[PDB]
Each structure stands twice: as C-alpha cells, then as structure tokens.
Write an enzyme that holds these catalytic residues in place. Structure first.
Site, PDB file in Angstrom:
ATOM      1  CG  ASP A 163      15.379  30.694  19.875  1.00 24.48           C
ATOM      2  OD1 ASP A 163      16.819  29.605  20.556  1.00 24.48           O
ATOM      3  OD2 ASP A 163      14.918  29.344  18.991  1.00 24.48           O
ATOM      4  CB  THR A 164      20.601  33.344  16.065  1.00 25.90           C
ATOM      5  OG1 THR A 164      20.961  34.432  16.408  1.00 25.90           O
ATOM      6  CG2 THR A 164      18.290  33.909  15.667  1.00 25.90           C
TER       7      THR A 164
ATOM      8  NE  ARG B 187      14.847  25.455  20.355  1.00 26.12           N
ATOM      9  CZ  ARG B 187      15.149  27.051  20.126  1.00 26.12           C
ATOM     10  NH1 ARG B 187      15.834  26.978  19.350  1.00 26.12           N
ATOM     11  NH2 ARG B 187      15.521  27.513  21.444  1.00 26.12           N
TER      12      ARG B 187
ATOM     13  CB  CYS C 126      21.315  36.534   8.495  1.00 18.20           C
ATOM     14  SG  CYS C 126      21.558  37.233   9.862  1.00 18.20           S
ATOM     15  CG  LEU C 127      18.322  42.261   7.822  1.00 18.13           C
ATOM     16  CD1 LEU C 127      16.902  43.313   7.326  1.00 18.13           C
ATOM     17  CD2 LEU C 127      20.002  43.498   5.999  1.00 18.13           C
ATOM     18  N   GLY C 128      21.503  40.187  11.083  1.00 16.92           N
ATOM     19  CA  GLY C 128      22.408  39.852  11.942  1.00 16.92           C
ATOM     20  C   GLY C 128      23.228  39.483  12.150  1.00 16.92           C
TER      21      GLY C 128
HETATM   22  C1  HEM Z   1      23.409  32.913  13.889  1.00 24.20           C
HETATM   23  C2  HEM Z   1      23.294  33.336  13.830  1.00 24.20           C
HETATM   24  C3  HEM Z   1      22.520  34.034  12.982  1.00 24.20           C
HETATM   25  C4  HEM Z   1      21.746  33.061  11.730  1.00 24.20           C
HETATM   26  C5  HEM Z   1      22.565  31.073  11.813  1.00 24.20           C
HETATM   27  C6  HEM Z   1      20.426  33.491  11.535  1.00 24.20           C
HETATM   28  C7  HEM Z   1      20.274  32.901  10.347  1.00 24.20           C
HETATM   29  C8  HEM Z   1      18.776  34.352   9.516  1.00 24.20           C
HETATM   30  C9  HEM Z   1      18.344  33.461   8.132  1.00 24.20           C
HETATM   31  C10 HEM Z   1      18.574  32.161   7.550  1.00 24.20           C
HETATM   32  C11 HEM Z   1      17.724  34.039   7.295  1.00 24.20           C
HETATM   33  C12 HEM Z   1      17.074  34.247   6.022  1.00 24.20           C
HETATM   34  C13 HEM Z   1      15.972  34.076   6.662  1.00 24.20           C
HETATM   35  C14 HEM Z   1      15.073  32.893   4.965  1.00 24.20           C
HETATM   36  O1  HEM Z   1      15.230  34.028   4.206  1.00 24.20           O
HETATM   37  O2  HEM Z   1      13.626  33.220   5.762  1.00 24.20           O
HETATM   38  C15 HEM Z   1      17.781  35.287   8.571  1.00 24.20           C
HETATM   39  C16 HEM Z   1      17.506  36.681   8.967  1.00 24.20           C
HETATM   40  C17 HEM Z   1      17.255  37.527   8.789  1.00 24.20           C
HETATM   41  N1  HEM Z   1      18.213  37.802  10.439  1.00 24.20           N
HETATM   42 FE1  HEM Z   1      19.360  35.936  10.753  1.00 24.20          FE
HETATM   43  N2  HEM Z   1      20.498  35.199  11.633  1.00 24.20           N
HETATM   44  C18 HEM Z   1      21.232  35.038  12.902  1.00 24.20           C
HETATM   45  C19 HEM Z   1      21.488  35.990  13.854  1.00 24.20           C
HETATM   46  C20 HEM Z   1      20.651  36.851  14.140  1.00 24.20           C
HETATM   47  C21 HEM Z   1      20.771  38.390  14.761  1.00 24.20           C
HETATM   48  C22 HEM Z   1      21.411  38.699  15.905  1.00 24.20           C
HETATM   49  C23 HEM Z   1      19.803  39.693  14.798  1.00 24.20           C
HETATM   50  C24 HEM Z   1      19.128  40.136  15.595  1.00 24.20           C
HETATM   51  C25 HEM Z   1      19.530  40.451  16.394  1.00 24.20           C
HETATM   52  C26 HEM Z   1      19.309  38.865  13.034  1.00 24.20           C
HETATM   53  C27 HEM Z   1      17.698  39.755  12.551  1.00 24.20           C
HETATM   54  C28 HEM Z   1      17.359  38.572  11.421  1.00 24.20           C
HETATM   55  C29 HEM Z   1      16.500  39.235  10.345  1.00 24.20           C
HETATM   56  C30 HEM Z   1      15.457  40.912  10.466  1.00 24.20           C
HETATM   57  C31 HEM Z   1      16.532  38.686   8.920  1.00 24.20           C
HETATM   58  C32 HEM Z   1      15.439  38.861   8.306  1.00 24.20           C
HETATM   59  C33 HEM Z   1      16.274  39.625   6.821  1.00 24.20           C
HETATM   60  C34 HEM Z   1      15.269  39.293   5.463  1.00 24.20           C
HETATM   61  O3  HEM Z   1      14.191  38.822   5.644  1.00 24.20           O
HETATM   62  O4  HEM Z   1      14.691  40.522   4.259  1.00 24.20           O
HETATM   63  N3  HEM Z   1      20.032  37.420  12.744  1.00 24.20           N
HETATM   64  N4  HEM Z   1      18.848  35.126   9.600  1.00 24.20           N
HETATM   65  C1  LIG Z   2      15.187  32.228  10.417  1.00 22.88           C
HETATM   66  C2  LIG Z   2      15.023  33.022  11.416  1.00 22.88           C
HETATM   67  C3  LIG Z   2      16.227  32.445  12.061  1.00 22.88           C
HETATM   68  C4  LIG Z   2      15.828  34.425  10.709  1.00 22.88           C
HETATM   69  C5  LIG Z   2      15.616  35.161  12.116  1.00 22.88           C
HETATM   70  C6  LIG Z   2      14.702  34.798  13.382  1.00 22.88           C
HETATM   71  C7  LIG Z   2      14.287  33.343  12.511  1.00 22.88           C
HETATM   72  C8  LIG Z   2      14.167  32.304  13.419  1.00 22.88           C
HETATM   73  C9  LIG Z   2      13.296  34.416  11.763  1.00 22.88           C
HETATM   74  O1  LIG Z   2      12.524  34.289  11.465  1.00 22.88           O
HETATM   75  C10 LIG Z   2      13.431  34.922  10.945  1.00 22.88           C
END
Ligand code: HEM
Ligand SMILES: CC1(C)[C@@H]2CC[C@@]1(C)C(=O)C2
Ligand SMILES: [K+]
Length: 405
Positions: A242-243, A177, A348-350
């Site tokens: 930021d999620t 943002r 998502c891995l998180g």
């Molecule tokens: C409400 C919380 C969250 C939401 C809605 C969310 C959403 C997402 C989404 C939509 C993606 C896929 C992005 C794409 O396909 O380009 C993603 C990927 C990922 N997220 Fe989350 N996320 C959240 C929390 C977190 C947290 C807390 C972490 C780590 C501290 C995290 C780590 C990651 C990572 C490492 C990926 C990459 C997976 C890959 O590219 O193979 N996320 N997330």
């Molecule tokens: C789109 C996302 C939520 C996902 C994890 C952090 C984020 C901003 C990314 O760059 C991949």
C-alpha cells in the site's frame, strides 16, 4: 462526527479537517490537504474529526516534531485513537532507544543490498506487464500495473503465493483507508492470523525469503521472538502492498495529463531519477503522527499528555515555505525539499526499493507507450487516509504510437 472540544483547546485553532474524507477531495488529494496551508490557517490546528487531534500544517513544525521523539512518541502513531492504540508494528510503534535495533534486521530484507538481488526481476516484470498492455490501447492503470507490479515483487521477496494478494490487499487497505467493515484492530488481527503459522513454519524450516530472514533474525545479537517477528512482518506487508502501489498512480495520472513532462523524460532520460524525486515531493501521500508524552507548549500552543498530533509527511514538500510554486512540477528543481519517506529516526527503510520501482516504471513505460491520455470523459477520483491513493485511472493511447522493445 465531531468530538467534543477538549477544555484546553481554544476555538480559534479549530479547523475540522477530516483526513479520511477531506472536503476539497475532488480537486485532488494533495490539493485537498493543502487547504491547511492557506495563509489564514495557523501552523498548528485542532480538528474535531476522527475523535479529535492536532494537525501540524507546515514543514518546519512537522520536521521538528518528528525529530523530538521525547515529546512526540510513535507508540500511538495513527488516528483514530483506537487504531493508534492497536497499532503495534515494529519498528514504527517504538521510540528510540529500543526502536533502533530492529531497523538493521528490516534492512536485511528490504534494504539496498536486497534491491540488488531483485533489480533484474523488477526490470523483467515491469517490461512484461507493460508489453502486455501496450497493444491494447487502454488500461485500468490501478489494477493492471500499479497494484500487480509492486505487489508481485513484494510477494516474491516474502515467499508468499500470488493468489493470496486479494485477501492481503483488502486487509492492508483497512489499516490505511478503512471502508468501515473492519476496525484497525480487526484488520491487524486478521493479518496476524495469516502470518503467525507461516512464521512458525519458517522458524522450523527456514528458507531464503524475507519472512524466514526476519523470523530467524537477531536484533543486537539476541534472537528475535516470534511475536516481534510477526509485528515486523506485518509492517513489511503493509509497505509492500500500500505505498508504491498508490504513488505510481499519482505519477502516471500526472504524466497522462502533461505531454511536456513526458517528452522531457523521453528526450533526456538521464533526468528520470530527478523526476522521481520531484514527483515524490509533489505527489507525496503519507500522513501519520505521534502522541504527546507530556504536557508541552509547542509554537505557542498548549498540548496535553495523551493528545494525538497528525504530522503529515505529505505537507512538508507542498509548503511554499519549503519549495516555491509547490504545486508546479519542475524536474530541474535545484533543492527538492520533502519528507515523503518520513523524517527523524523512523526514515523509510523501503525507500530504495520504492525508488527503484518508480524509476523502472517511468523508464520502461515511456520507452513503450510515450503517448497516452486520460480516457475520454473520465474524471479521476482520489481517496484519502494514512496513505492516499487514486480510485481508478483509465488510460488510452493509439497503439500505432507505441514501441515493442
Ligand atoms: C512511495 C513509497 C513509500 C513511502 C512514501 C513510504 C513512507 C514511509 C514513511 C513516511 C515512513 C515513516 C512513518 C513514521 O515515521 O511513522 C515509513 C517507514 C517505513 N517504511 Fe516506507 N514508504 C514507502 C515504501 C515502503 C516499502 C515499499 C516498504 C517495504 C516493503 C517500506 C517499509 C517501511 C518500513 C519497514 C518503515 C519503518 C521504519 C521505522 O519505523 O523505523 N516502505 N515509510
Ligand atoms: C506510514 C507507513 C507508510 C509506514 C510504512 C507503512 C505505513 C502505512 C506504516 O504503518 C509505517
Ligand atoms: K500502540
């Protein structure tokens, strides 16, 4: 500004939606994005905003495109183009096959087994932050809980000092943002400027923190490079800062406005996991996308190699074609369809850490402060981007109606 219409794009598909400042924003950000799902709007539109890009507006198309990485590449996943080009985080900036090996390493630091080593500390921090607020009868929820709770857990996991939060949070927010003071590229290089030396120190002298584990990790049996480690750690910081931080505010705003839904979870606490899922659907908040690897006709529309397409994860679950009465929150909904945590190979891995933080918050907040409201005369303002959020959330309650555990 509106970018010149490319020669292959017909006028009848032009819908000038601005993902960083949507026109209906005052209605709520989800509502603002849902204008793309009014009956007269095609499944696939072109906006001239933010340099010009496609937007898939329906879950069917969003899912299909996320599955087809051979046409829809993650190499350039952010709009505007300058941001997608600069974006080089791992694994997100890679397509299969090379993407996959990096997921296992990321799972070692944010996956379900790690949630286990953190459950007690997650629980204890939620309880202490909420108990500190409880007797006050008011809080600024974004700054008083939504930020410090997930961010302090992440900083603990990553072995980073809490006094670094303001700087890191500022940089992270410029990637999702932007306020205009930094380009994505500038924000990313500032984040890397922070990380590179910490990564070298933890390769020289490994600890037990997430940065050490990534920096000394292996990927399919060979050593990770310093550069790859940096590109993974950057992504983890952004996920940590930021999620969930934003999602908690949408959820708490909803609960402040709906006493019925609060009572449901107080009376039937077994429903909290289901409620978490329904809230993840209704208050979905992420929108990134892909770049076309070739000319491609998709649902009757000619796409051109190099075109960007925004595939809003937020929109699938709000689509009435996926869930009836989609703007209604029903904790008993039988099939909660959504792509809130993504779709395809980049799931998502998180998400297990996220769900734990959400469920703990719901349980521990309602245990102590079952009765609360939006502050008198406040009108809650949202903000939109790659990740959407809540600008401020002033809450009030009568301390007599609360419970110290
Ligand atoms: C409400 C919380 C969250 C939401 C809605 C969310 C959403 C997402 C989404 C939509 C993606 C896929 C992005 C794409 O396909 O380009 C993603 C990927 C990922 N997220 Fe989350 N996320 C959240 C929390 C977190 C947290 C807390 C972490 C780590 C501290 C995290 C780590 C990651 C990572 C490492 C990926 C990459 C997976 C890959 O590219 O193979 N996320 N997330
Ligand atoms: C789109 C996302 C939520 C996902 C994890 C952090 C984020 C901003 C990314 O760059 C991949
Ligand atoms: K890129």
């Amino acid at each position: 500004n509106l970018a010149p219409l490319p020669p292959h794009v017909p006028e009848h598909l032009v819908f000038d939606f601005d993902m960083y400042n949507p026109s209906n924003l005052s209605a709520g950000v989800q509502e603002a994005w849902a204008v793309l799902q009014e009956s007269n709007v095609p499944d696939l539109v072109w906006t001239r905003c933010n340099g010009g890009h496609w937007i898939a507006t329906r879950g069917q198309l969003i899912r299909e495109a996320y599955e087809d990485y051979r046409h829809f590449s993650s190499e350039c996943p952010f709009i505007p183009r300058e941001a997608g080009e600069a974006y080089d985080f791992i694994p997100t900036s890679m397509d299969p096959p090379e993407q996959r090996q990096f997921r296992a390493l990321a799972n070692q630091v944010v996956g379900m087994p790690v949630v286990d080593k953190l459950e007690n500390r997650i629980q204890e921090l939620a309880c202490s932050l909420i108990e500190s607020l409880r007797p006050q009868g008011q809080c600024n929820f974004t700054e008083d809980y939504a930020e410090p709770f997930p961010i302090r857990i992440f900083m603990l996991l990553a072995g980073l000092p809490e006094e670094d939060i303001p700087h890191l949070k500022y940089l992270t927010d410029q990637m999702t943002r932007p306020d205009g003071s930094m380009t994505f590229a500038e924000a990313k290089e500032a984040l890397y400027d922070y990380l590179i030396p910490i990564i070298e120190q933890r390769r020289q002298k490994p600890g037990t923190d997430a940065i050490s584990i990534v920096a000394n990790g292996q990927v399919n049996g060979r050593p990770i490079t310093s550069d790859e480690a940096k590109r993974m750690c950057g992504l983890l910081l952004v996920g940590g800062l930021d999620t969930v931080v934003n999602f908690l505010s949408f959820s708490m705003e909803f609960l402040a406005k709906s006493p019925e839904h609060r009572q449901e979870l107080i009376e039937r606490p077994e429903r909290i996991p289901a409620a978490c899922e329904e809230l993840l659907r209704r208050f979905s908040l992420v929108a990134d996308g892909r770049i076309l690897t070739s000319d491609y006709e998709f649902h009757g529309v000619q796409l051109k190699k190099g075109d960007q397409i925004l595939l809003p994860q937020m929109l699938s679950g709000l689509d009435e074609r996926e869930n009836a009465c989609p703007m209604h929150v029903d904790f008993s909904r039988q099939k909660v369809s959504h792509t809130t945590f993504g779709h395809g190979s980049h799931l998502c891995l998180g998400q297990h850490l996220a769900r734990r933080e959400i469920i703990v918050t719901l349980k521990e907040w309602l245990t102590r402060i079952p009765d609360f409201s939006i502050a008198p005369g406040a009108q809650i303002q949202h903000k939109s981007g790659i990740v959407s959020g809540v600008q401020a959330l002033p809450l009030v309650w009568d301390p007599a109606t609360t419970k110290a555990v």
